[PDB]
């Protein structure tokens, strides 16, 4: 889930402050005029329409993104394993980890054993998978870079470290009301909020 970690808006008191499209993820910024911002002393900007307010807000990974986070995957077939016990013959023991590919031995104990390949290639994982903590979902996640806001993957970071991401959150700033300092951020709660 996102966090609309709003940078603190500019308030020019008499005249405009043009905004620029900073490279923050989903950097929504919209200049606003026609304010009279009550801040602790009543208003403070002495004009009345030239009072300008520039709201800016970008999307950022939550602190929970590091730890409580869904996780997509493109899943191929790989190679299956097993801790095969054989309490063999009179040997009476070997508990060894093996493979399935039909030329791999595993000389753990005394016996050499070749397994598979199995005929039952049903990977219960689908091609596309989402993963969450322990509950694994064979979900057709839309993709990195695309996820519709509100839908799953509104925030899409490659990894946790990745400062870049894709944040289609439909974050739309609105003008603050009646000459008061604040930042209307109108936004879909995450497609990670739903999906839980």
């Amino acid at each position: 889930k996102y966090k609309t970690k709003v940078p603190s808006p500019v308030v020019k008191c008499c005249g405009a402050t043009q905004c620029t499209s900073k490279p923050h993820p989903d950097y929504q910024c919209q200049v606003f005029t026609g304010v009279y911002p009550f801040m602790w002393g009543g208003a403070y900007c002495f004009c009345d329409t030239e009072n300008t307010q520039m709201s800016e807000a970008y999307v950022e990974r939550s602190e929970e993104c590091s730890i409580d986070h869904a996780k997509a995957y493109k899943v191929h077939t790989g190679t299956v394993q097993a801790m095969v016990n054989i309490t063999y013959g009179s040997v009476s023991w070997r508990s060894a980890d093996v493979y399935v590919n039909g030329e791999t031995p595993a000389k753990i104990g005394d016996a050499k054993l070749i397994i598979g390949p199995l005929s039952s290639a049903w990977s219960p994982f689908d091609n596309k998978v989402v993963v969450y903590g322990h509950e694994v979902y064979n979900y057709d996640f839309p993709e990195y870079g695309t996820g519709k806001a509100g839908s799953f993957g509104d925030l899409q970071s490659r990894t946790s470290t990745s400062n870049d991401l894709y944040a289609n959150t439909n974050l739309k700033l609105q003008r603050p009301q009646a000459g008061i300092v604040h930042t209307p951020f109108t936004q879909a709660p995450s497609g990670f909020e739903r999906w839980k």
Binding site: V6, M39, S62
Partner: protein
């Protein structure tokens, strides 16, 4: 201790020092991490986390925490404070409603935020019990020795203070806190920047047409949305967060055991939970044929078990398994 604009500050939109931003009802353990714009913790100088520094005036007031109240639909329970930030064990609530008592006044602050507490588990409780299994919840720490993240905390912008703009018996008279930087002019033409000690105003007379400002950037702030930018620069002040979300194993849920009843390749199960419990199964044939249903109302259910087996998940109670030959 920053001061911002609380939205429904008892009456209506005041400017409380405990103005609530970044409500996070995103964990599971009945807990919310909150940021006041007020920085409680140690005093102004050096002592005792359990004291209380908010802004009164331009000034702090680093005194005792005596009667804090976070609350929601019900009164919450504090967990710990550090910096601008408090952790508190709350129930669910449509809103969040915070406030201490200075002693002369209630002086609270309140806010909207959708809160819930699902515990982790297939049981949908409303509250953590005393018993049950432990399993990997998401939750915030008690502690402060914490660096797992840090939020930008650069300077404050100016602030209004019309207590400054007195009158010099005919002219409007600005003063200064301690030699702080007061940014000044009036609608008329007079002194145009203001980086001064206590000035007068030659031209204008009315207090209501002048720039009562306080560039007082000796201490940085949280970068609240309810902050005016310090226009000069992105000063330093990268500053940690205490209450990281951690992988605590909450003391957690458990649903009452089922009543297993045999039939021919069929489990009748008279069932009777405490709370809404997500039951589900997996007929282990390559035909999965699973089932899901939250059960809060006691219900006798049925499961066509096959020859090879079925499994059965009474909430976060462990999964069962069954031979029905």
């Amino acid at each position: 201790p920053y001061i911002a604009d609380c939205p429904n500050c008892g009456h209506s939109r005041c400017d409380s020092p405990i103005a609530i931003e970044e409500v996070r009802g995103d964990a599971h353990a009945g807990v919310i991490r909150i940021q006041t714009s007020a920085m409680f913790g140690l005093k102004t100088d050096g002592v005792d986390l359990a004291y209380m520094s908010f802004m009164n005036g331009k000034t702090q007031k680093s005194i005792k925490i005596d009667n804090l109240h976070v609350r929601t639909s019900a009164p919450c329970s504090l967990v710990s404070h550090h910096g601008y930030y408090i952790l508190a064990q709350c129930p669910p609530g449509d809103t969040v409603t915070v406030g201490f008592h200075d002693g002369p006044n209630r002086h609270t602050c309140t806010v909207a935020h959708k809160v819930e507490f699902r515990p982790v588990g297939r049981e949908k409780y409303r509250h953590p019990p005393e018993h049950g299994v432990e399993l990997p919840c998401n939750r915030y720490t008690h502690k402060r020795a914490d660096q797992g993240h840090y939020v930008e905390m650069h300077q404050p912008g100016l602030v209004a203070d019309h207590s400054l703009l007195s009158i010099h018996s005919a002219k409007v008279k600005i003063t200064v806190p301690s030699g702080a930087q007061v940014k000044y002019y009036c609608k008329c033409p007079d002194v145009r920047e203001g980086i001064t000690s206590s000035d007068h105003t030659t031209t204008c007379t009315d207090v209501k047409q002048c720039r009562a400002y306080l560039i007082d950037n000796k201490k940085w702030v949280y970068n609240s949305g309810r902050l005016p930018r310090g226009e000069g620069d992105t000063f330093k002040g990268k500053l940690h967060v205490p209450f990281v979300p951690v992988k605590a194993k909450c003391i957690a849920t458990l649903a009452p055991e089922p009543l297993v009843e045999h039939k021919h390749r069929t489990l009748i199960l008279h069932l009777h939970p405490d709370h809404p419990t997500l039951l589900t199964t997996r007929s282990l044939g390559s035909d999965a044929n699973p089932t899901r249903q939250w059960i809060e109302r006691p219900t006798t259910v049925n499961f066509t078990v096959t020859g090879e087996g079925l499994e059965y998940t009474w909430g976060n109670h462990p999964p069962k398994r069954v031979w029905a030959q």
